[PDB]
Amino acid sequence: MERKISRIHLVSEPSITHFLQVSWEKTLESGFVITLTDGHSAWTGTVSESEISQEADDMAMEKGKYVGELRKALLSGAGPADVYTFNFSKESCYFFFEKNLKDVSFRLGSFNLEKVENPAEVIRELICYCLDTIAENQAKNEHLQKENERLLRDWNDVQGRFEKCVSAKEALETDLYKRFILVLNEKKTKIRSLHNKLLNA
Amino acid sequence: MERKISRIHLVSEPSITHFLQVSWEKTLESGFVITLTDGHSAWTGTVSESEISQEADDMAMEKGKYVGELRKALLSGAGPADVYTFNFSKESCYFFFEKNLKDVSFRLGSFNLEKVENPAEVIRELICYCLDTIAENQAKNEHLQKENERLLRDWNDVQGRFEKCVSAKEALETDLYKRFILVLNEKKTKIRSLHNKLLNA
C-alpha cells in the first residue's frame, strides 16, 4: 500500500498551490485512487484497473508508455525538459492533465472527481502520515549514521595495522641485509688477504 | 528559526487529533508562536519572554526547569513516566495544559489564542514545510547510504590486500636466507679452491 503526495499549481489560480495524492496497492497498472485538496476543500476519484485499459485505448498509445507517463507526471518524476499542465474545473468536476512541448500540448489524461463529505479527515490523515514519515526517516538516519561511524573506525584501524605491517617488513629486511653484508665483507677481507699476500709470498 | 509539529488529543473532544506547531526564533526562553489546527479552523497565539518569566515566578520554581517542562510538554519530548492533558475552549478561545499525576493535576500553562481569518493558508504552509522536510531528509539518507556502501567496499578491498601483504611477509625471510646461503657457499668454494691449490703448490 503505497501513497505519494505532490504539490501542483492549477492553471485557474496560479497563486495558491493545490496538493495531489495518489494511493495504489502495488502498481499504477492496477489502478489507484486520487485525492485533490486545497486545505479547505477536497475531491476524490478512482482509476481502477478496468478503466486504465479503456483510457489507454482512447489515448491510442502504448499501454506501458501511458502508465510510464502517468507515473512520471503524477509522482513528481518530471524531468527538467518535460513540463505538464493540470486543469481542474469544479463547476463540472473534471481534472485533466496534458504535456506541453514545443509550444504545442498533447492530451495525456482526464478524470472525474466527486467532492468528499468532510475535508478534515483527509487533511488529518495526510499530515498524520507525513509526521510518521518524518519520524521513520529520522530513525533511519540515526541508524545509518551509527553504521557510518562504525565503518570509519574500522577503516582507520585497518590503515593503522597495514602501516604497522609495512614498518615490520622494512625493519626485518634492512636488519637481515646489514647483518649479512657484515659477514660477506669479513669473508671478502680474508679471501683478498689470502689471494694477495699468500700468492705474493 | 525552529519549528516543531506535534499531535495532541483535546479532552473536550477526545475523538479527533489536533495538531499544534511551536515556532521559536532561537530558543524557547525568548518566546514562541503556537498554531493549533484541527483541519478546518486554526487558532494562533504568541508567547513572549515577559509572560514566560512571569509564569515562572508565579510557578515558584526556577526558569530553567520551567522551560524544560514546557519543552517536554509542547515539543513532544515527553518520556515514559509523564502524562499531559490539554484543554481548549473555543467560545472563549482559551488553551491550557496540565500534568496529571496520580489524580493530582498541575496547571502548567494557560495561553490565549485568536482565531485566524484564513485557515487554508496556514494549513497549506504547514503541509508544505513538512513536505520540504521529507524531501530534504531523503537526500541525506541516500547520500549516507552511498557513502557507507563505498566505505564498505574500500574496507573489504584493503583487508583483502592486507592478507596478501602479510602472507608475503611470512616468506621474505626464507627468500632472503636462500640467496644469502647460496652466495656464501659460492664464495666458500672459491676460498677453498684458493687455499687447496696454494697448499698443494
Swiss-Prot record, chains A, B:
One cellular component (GO) term of this entry: cytosol
Location of region: Interaction with LIG4: 180-201
Result for mutant: residue 99 to E: Abolished interaction with NHEJ1/XLF. Abolished ability to bridge DNA. Abolished ability to bridge DNA
Location(s) in or outside the cell: Nucleus; Chromosome
Any GO molecular function: DNA binding
Modification Phosphoserine occurs at: 53, 193
Outcome (variant: residue 106 to E): Abolished interaction with NHEJ1/XLF
Region (Interaction with IFFO1): 1-201
Residue runs in coiled coils: 131-165, 184-201
Effect of substituting residue 192 to A: Abolished DNA-binding
Effect in UniProt of substituting residue 161 to Q: In SSMED; no expression of the protein is observed; complete loss of function in DNA double-strand break repair
Effect ascribed to mutating residue 69 to R: Does not affect interaction with NHEJ1/XLF
Keywords tagged on the record: Chromosome, Coiled coil, Cytoplasm, Disease variant, DNA damage, DNA recombination, DNA repair, DNA-binding, Dwarfism, Isopeptide bond, Nucleus, Phosphoprotein, Ubl conjugation
Consequence when changing residue 26 to E: Abolished interaction with NHEJ1/XLF
Distribution of this protein across tissues and organs: Widely expressed.
Processing and modification events after translation: Phosphorylations by PRKDC at the C-terminus of XRCC4 and NHEJ1/XLF are highly redundant and regulate ability of the XRCC4-NHEJ1/XLF subcomplex to bridge DNA. Phosphorylation by PRKDC does not prevent interaction with NHEJ1/XLF but disrupts ability to bridge DNA and promotes detachment from DNA.
GO biological process: base-excision repair; cellular response to lithium ion; double-strand break repair; double-strand break repair via nonhomologous end joining; immunoglobulin V(D)J recombination; positive regulation of ligase activity; protein localization to site of double-strand break; response to X-ray
Disease link: Short stature, microcephaly, and endocrine dysfunction: A disease characterized by short stature and microcephaly apparent at birth, progressive postnatal growth failure, and endocrine dysfunction. In affected adults endocrine features include hypergonadotropic hypogonadism, multinodular goiter, and diabetes mellitus. Variable features observed in some patients are progressive ataxia, and lymphopenia or borderline leukopenia.
Assigned protein family: Belongs to the XRCC4-XLF family. XRCC4 subfamily.
Protein name, UniProt field: DNA repair protein XRCC4
